[PDB]
Design an enzyme around this catalytic site. Structure first.
Site, PDB file in Angstrom:
ATOM      1  N   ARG A   1       0.823  -1.338   0.119  1.00  0.00           N
ATOM      2  CA  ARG A   1      -0.150  -0.013  -0.025  1.00  0.00           C
ATOM      3  C   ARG A   1       0.705   1.380   0.149  1.00  0.00           C
ATOM      4  O   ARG A   1       1.801   1.347   0.662  1.00  0.00           O
ATOM      5  CB  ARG A   1      -0.796  -0.032   1.020  1.00  0.00           C
ATOM      6  CG  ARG A   1      -2.111   1.080   1.015  1.00  0.00           C
ATOM      7  CD  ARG A   1      -3.173   1.178   2.012  1.00  0.00           C
ATOM      8  NE  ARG A   1      -2.538   1.463   3.347  1.00  0.00           N
ATOM      9  CZ  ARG A   1      -3.147   2.077   4.340  1.00  0.00           C
ATOM     10  NH1 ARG A   1      -4.323   2.470   4.242  1.00  0.00           N
ATOM     11  NH2 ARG A   1      -2.528   2.407   5.565  1.00  0.00           N
TER      12      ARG A   1
ATOM     13  N   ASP B   1     -11.287   5.934   8.105  1.00  0.00           N
ATOM     14  CA  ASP B   1     -10.764   6.682   6.993  1.00  0.00           C
ATOM     15  C   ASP B   1     -11.821   7.952   6.800  1.00  0.00           C
ATOM     16  O   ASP B   1     -11.692   9.018   6.735  1.00  0.00           O
ATOM     17  CB  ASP B   1      -9.975   6.215   5.845  1.00  0.00           C
ATOM     18  CG  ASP B   1      -8.782   5.471   6.220  1.00  0.00           C
ATOM     19  OD1 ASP B   1      -7.969   6.324   6.793  1.00  0.00           O
ATOM     20  OD2 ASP B   1      -8.487   4.457   5.651  1.00  0.00           O
TER      21      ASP B   1
END
Ligand SMILES: [Cl-]
Ligand SMILES: [Cl-]
Lengths: 931, 139
Positions: free
Chosen positions: A443, A590
């Site tokens: 990521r 998030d």
């Protein structure tokens, strides 16, 4: 020593009723706490034990009636301790809390289910005591939906549950301590066997004490903030603990349940119903400690762990496979293998004769596994080997071929039962775990890829890829992916960061494709972000490129996400490269950090709806990856309903969920817990594919659209518009000390916008306030009740009949159970300026109002009215956490303010930073998951 | 060896230094680490075939059909540019692979071993520039 009489009384006042009649939780924790306090007295004196016990009794009385005097009584003791006593008391309450956790796991694991407690609807699927097991799910699909067993079987064959292990946001508990906890749970469970002899019981008691002391006498602070390789080692412990043995046991139970509805086949041994993926060593988003070498290291370490386990398991397999009758094909292979050089079974046989053909083939497999292990070890510790690649297994097919030959051969001769034993377990372990146990995802921020492409275009005198519009970015990227000329070479000005990105791709190219899963783009917003990764992959000579997965975080990014994915599917090159499959990631935490939690929830339901529409348009099989913070990331029974709550056709036989590190012990630490985890993921995936939740009534959609606007207004007006919010955040919470301390990585990557979501949640979870989780719900529900008298009834209908809404509210209710405004007020009183006190006071009023409104929505008078077992266990843990809260608060005041002199107490028998770290790790371990 | 020579001369032992040691120094200077330096020689047409397969692969035309002036202009734009020319995704005949592999082997060995790259049947500046470019792009 009649002290035991007091803690029993306090424990019984904390957990009064019995949630069943096998409810031995108070007994369990009373025994563990008595034994611990005895160890504590023997090591650190009688006074220390008396001080600690007085503190715990006051904490439990507080978790009973919440009298503020109890908090002042805790503080009076805790400030008067010199740093030595502070360390011993903090350590003591950490281990006491751990013991309460272990008792809770045993209680969960051995609680008898109740068939008569099922109501018959989906609410039952929110608790482990009433959820549907595998076979009950089968019969629910056969009776109510009239699906034929063959359709159920065909759904299972092609279903995959993909569990993704991510690093713990704090103390990734060391493998040794996991093992000690295991021994404590085992001694506890065995001590209550209703048939045990006096001497067995005495030796079990002594073993339990011995283990509790062992855990209390190991340091858990020094050395390093463990290197990513160490954190990965600790995270892999659950394969040895339960998962390795657990997968074939679970699959065999799937077979039995299929037999109980008329299916005579077994689930094919190569079918990937269960898969495991890892971020440990692959997630670089805001983590410079995760280097290209870290990734190479954890890849090779995983290949080693797997080869080790196969090596040890294939010796038992070799002893069982003593048959002689075989296939013509296998007999040919036995004669071929016998023409060669038997070093790893001299203790077993001088050599394997040809009249044991299965043993011949399997012995050669054992030899290849040994060479694979030793080779990966040589690559890890040097960079080269000398072990011929042809003497090892490089891909999964080389490994499966001889085992499948053994299976076919055994079935040819009517030895199918023999084949369906250790050999079937082995085949299913090879199919589930492959040569790596896990597949590593990579990521990285999209901006880092933008920096790389910008340096490239600047170096070619074509402009700055960064200044280009999204359409121009797409046009250039498209001309390059379709072109025949390479893009860049060594003659390229590389910054340190740009070299990190490119080197990560080079390491990916130099390792086997079996080791990698998805390349995940943090802060993905546009198709150019995905095309950048596909192009960088291709130009870094990655022969089998990873699948690219955008992570749409901010709210606007979610709204634009189906448009971006549609534009991606519409490009011919990307369409033919992905081969009909696309994975998209969503981050509940998030998105909530951006726009509050209620708005992020409803927005994620809608975003998945539209993404399924796009995937059906273009004939692509969509896979939704649930990041951390979700309803499907909870611990235990709730996950079952959360999976069932997802929008129709969003799963479609392919579930990918993050197993949060603060939950992985509750889910995979124990044998039964492991089986039930795998079971509910499998059953809920299967059921959701054939039985979607009800489609929301139009007024429900409109109402939630309204509530989302009001909730985002309140959340952003407090978090982002109030000028002194950041000042308060730095006082009423250990956010600054968390990053500065030692845990995780970097928390910033300015204000809150640049602050990562994990420190955002953590900072407020430590103070038992949980602002990031509930803020926004209050004003939204107030707004809709005031706009129309009847909206309350509508909310109450949604919670009762719409799974998505019920799980969203249920999660909020659970977080409120772990919250306490009085403790947060203590933090304000000690650490916050006086002119900011009303600010926190107002926030606490918001906390209270939302709580009542959430209750009103759920039709409850008390929190968790429908799940008393969880209410009970949470109350048990909270009694220990509260002491660590008060200790942490006064310790913070002592660190920040050297002008705060305290009247010390004499030291109690044989550094404030260590105290603070202890309280953080402890509180984090007691609160586990929130949002 | 030069340290030994300087040291010997410092102490008035220059005659001793001008013996076996001088012979050795002159042998190291004459013969180096290789005795000989190896020249590589190849027809110009073979380099033309390589560049022609390249330009055909990029859909820019056939370097072979181009006039000498156009050949020079393209070669000059490539030697002065910042982007590499070709990769593994390139249809290579057996001969073209021989030429490129020779350059790769040259790159993988010490420079003390090589002298000159000699172009047989050289006729035009593009023949020389082709070799300079192929050298640079084979690293
Ligand atoms: Cl290492
Ligand atoms: Cl022997």
């Amino acid at each position: 020593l009649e002290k035991m009489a007091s803690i029993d009384v306090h424990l019984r006042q904390l957990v009064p009723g019995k949630v069943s009649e096998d409810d031995k939780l108070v007994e369990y924790d009373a025994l563990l706490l008595d034994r611990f306090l005895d160890i504590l007295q023997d090591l650190h004196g009688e006074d220390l034990r008396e001080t600690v016990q007085e503190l715990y009794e006051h904490s439990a009385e507080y978790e009973g009636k919440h009298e503020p005097k109890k908090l002042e009584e805790l503080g009076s003791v805790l400030t008067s301790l010199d740093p030595g006593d502070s360390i011993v008391i903090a350590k003591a309450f950490s281990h006491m809390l751990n013991l309460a956790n272990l008792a809770e796991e045993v209680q969960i694991a051995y609680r008898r289910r109740i068939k008569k407690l099922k109501k018959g609807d989906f609410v039952d699927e929110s608790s482990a005591t009433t959820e549907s097991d595998l076979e009950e799910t089968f019969k629910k699909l056969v009776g109510d939906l009239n699906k034929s067993p063959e359709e159920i079987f065909d759904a299972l064959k092609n279903q995959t549950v993909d569990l993704v292990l991510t690093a713990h946001p704090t103390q990734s508990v060391r493998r040794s301590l996991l093992q000690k906890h295991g021994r404590i749970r085992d001694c506890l469970a065995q001590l209550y066997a209703k048939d045990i002899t006096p001497d067995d019981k005495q030796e079990l008691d002594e073993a339990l004490q011995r283990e509790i002391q062992a855990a209390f006498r190991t340091d858990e602070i020094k050395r390093t903030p463990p290197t990513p390789q160490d954190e990965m080692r600790a995270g892999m412990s659950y394969f040895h603990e339960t998962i390795w043995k657990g997968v074939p046991k679970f699959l065999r139970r799937v077979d039995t349940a299929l037999k109980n509805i008329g299916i005579e086949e077994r689930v094919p041994y190569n079918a990937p119903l269960i898969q495991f993926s890892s971020w440990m060593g692959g997630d670089r988003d805001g983590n410079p400690r995760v280097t290209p070498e870290v990734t190479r290291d954890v890849c090779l370490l995983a290949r080693m762990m797997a080869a080790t386990m196969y090596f040890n398991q294939i010796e038992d397999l070799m002893f069982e496979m003593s048959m002689w009758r075989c296939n013509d094909e296998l007999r040919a292979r036995a004669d071929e293998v016998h023409a060669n050089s038997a070093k790893h079974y001299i203790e077993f046989w001088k050599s394997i004769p040809t009249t044991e053909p299965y043993r011949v083939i399997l012995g050669d497999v054992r030899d290849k596994l040994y060479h694979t292990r030793e080779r990966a070890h040589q690559l890890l510790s040097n960079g080269h080997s000398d072990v011929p690649v042809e003497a090892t297994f490089i891909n999964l097919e080389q490994f499966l071929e001889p085992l499948e030959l053994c299976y076919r051969s055994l079935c040819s001769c009517g030895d199918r039962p023999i084949a369906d034993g250790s050999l079937l377990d082995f085949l299913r372990q090879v199919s589930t775990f492959g040569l790596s146990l896990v597949r590593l995802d990579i990521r990285q921020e999209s901006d880092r890829h933008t920096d790389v492409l910008d340096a490239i275009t600047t170096h070619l005198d074509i402009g700055s890829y960064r200044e280009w519009s999204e359409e121009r970015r797409q046009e250039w990227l498209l001309s390059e992916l379709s072109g025949k000329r390479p893009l860049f070479g060594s003659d390229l000005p590389k910054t340190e960061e740009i070299a990190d990105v490119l080197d990560t791709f080079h390491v990916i190219a130099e390792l086997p494709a079996d080791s990698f899963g998805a390349y995940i783009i943090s802060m993905a917003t546009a198709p150019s972000d995905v095309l950048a990764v596909e192009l960088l992959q291709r130009e870094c000579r990655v022969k089998q490129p990873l699948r690219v997965v955008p992570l749409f975080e901010k709210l606007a990014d979610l709204e634009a996400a189906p448009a971006a994915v549609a534009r991606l599917f519409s490009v011919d090159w990307y369409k033919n490269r992905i081969n009909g499959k696309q994975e998209v990631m969503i981050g509940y935490s998030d998105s909530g950090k951006d726009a509050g939690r209620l708005s992020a929830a409803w927005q994620l339901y809608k975003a998945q709806e539209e993404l399924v529409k796009v995937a059906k348009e273009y004939g692509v099989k969509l896979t939704m990856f649930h990041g951390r913070g979700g309803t499907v990331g909870r611990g235990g029974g709730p996950t079952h309903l959360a999976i069932l709550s997802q929008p129709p056709d969003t799963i479609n036989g392919s579930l990918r969920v993050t197993v949060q590190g603060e939950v992985i012990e509750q889910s995979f630490g124990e044998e039964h817990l492991c089986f039930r985890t795998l079971q509910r993921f499998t059953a809920a995936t299967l059921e959701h594919g054939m039985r979607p939740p009800i489609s929301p009534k139009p007024e429900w959609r409109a109402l939630l659209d309204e509530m989302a606007v009001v909730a985002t207004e309140e959340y952003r007006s407090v978090v982002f518009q109030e000028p002194r919010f950041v000042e308060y955040f730095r006082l009423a919470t250990p956010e600054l000390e968390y990053g500065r301390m030692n845990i995780g990585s970097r928390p910033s990557k300015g204000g809150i916008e640049s602050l990562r979501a994990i420190p955002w949640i953590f900072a407020w979870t430590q103070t038992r306030f949980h602002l990031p989780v509930w803020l926004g719900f209050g004003s939204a529900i107030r707004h809709v009740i005031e706009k129309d008298v009847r909206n309350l009834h509508m909310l109450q209908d949604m919670y009762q009949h719409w799974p998505f809404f019920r799980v969203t509210i249920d999660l909020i209710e659970m977080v409120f159970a772990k919250g306490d405004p009085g403790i947060a007020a203590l933090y304000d009183k000690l650490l916050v300026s006086e002119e900011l006190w009303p600010f926190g006071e107002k926030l606490r009023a918001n906390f209270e109002e939302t709580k009542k409104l959430i209750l009103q929505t759920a039709g409850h008078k008390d929190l968790l009215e429908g799940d008393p077992y969880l209410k009970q266990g949470l109350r048990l843990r909270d009694s220990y956490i509260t002491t660590l809260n008060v200790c942490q608060a006064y310790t913070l005041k002592r660190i920040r303010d050297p002008s705060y002199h305290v009247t010390l107490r004499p030291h109690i028998s044989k550094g404030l930073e260590d105290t603070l770290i202890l309280t953080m790790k402890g509180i984090a371990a007691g609160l586990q998951n929130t949002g």
